[PDB]
């Protein structure tokens, strides 16, 4: 392992801001 929640999900591997910005980029690749 090499991460804490503060560095695993703090506008880093999720973002998902109210209008949805990078989560959409991830969503394009995933789906």
Keywords:
31 residues; mainly alpha; antimicrobial protein
Describe the structure in your own words:
The protein is built from two helices and no strands. It has 31 residues and is mostly helical. It has one domain. The chain is flat, with a radius of gyration of 11 Å.
Layout of helices and strands:
Elements: H1 5-8, H2 22-30
PDB class: antimicrobial protein
Keywords: cathelicidin, antimicrobial protein
Assembly: monomeric
Tell me about the biggest sheet? none
Structural class: mainly alpha
- Continuous helix count: 2
What separation lies between the terminal Cα atoms?
27 Å
Rounded Rg = 11 Å
Order of helices and strands: HH
How many structural units, i.e. domains?
A: 1
The total count of strands amounts to 0
Instruction: Note the quaternary state here.
Output: monomer
Q: Report helical residue fraction.
A: 40-55%
Overall form: flat
Estimate what percentage of residues fall within beta strands: under 5%
Question: What would a concise description of this structure say?
Answer:
The chain is mostly helical and 31 residues long.
């Amino acid at each position: 392992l090499v991460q804490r929640g503060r560095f695993g999900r703090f506008l880093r591997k999720i973002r998902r801001f109210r209008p949805k910005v990078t989560i959409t980029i991830q969503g394009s690749a995933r789906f």
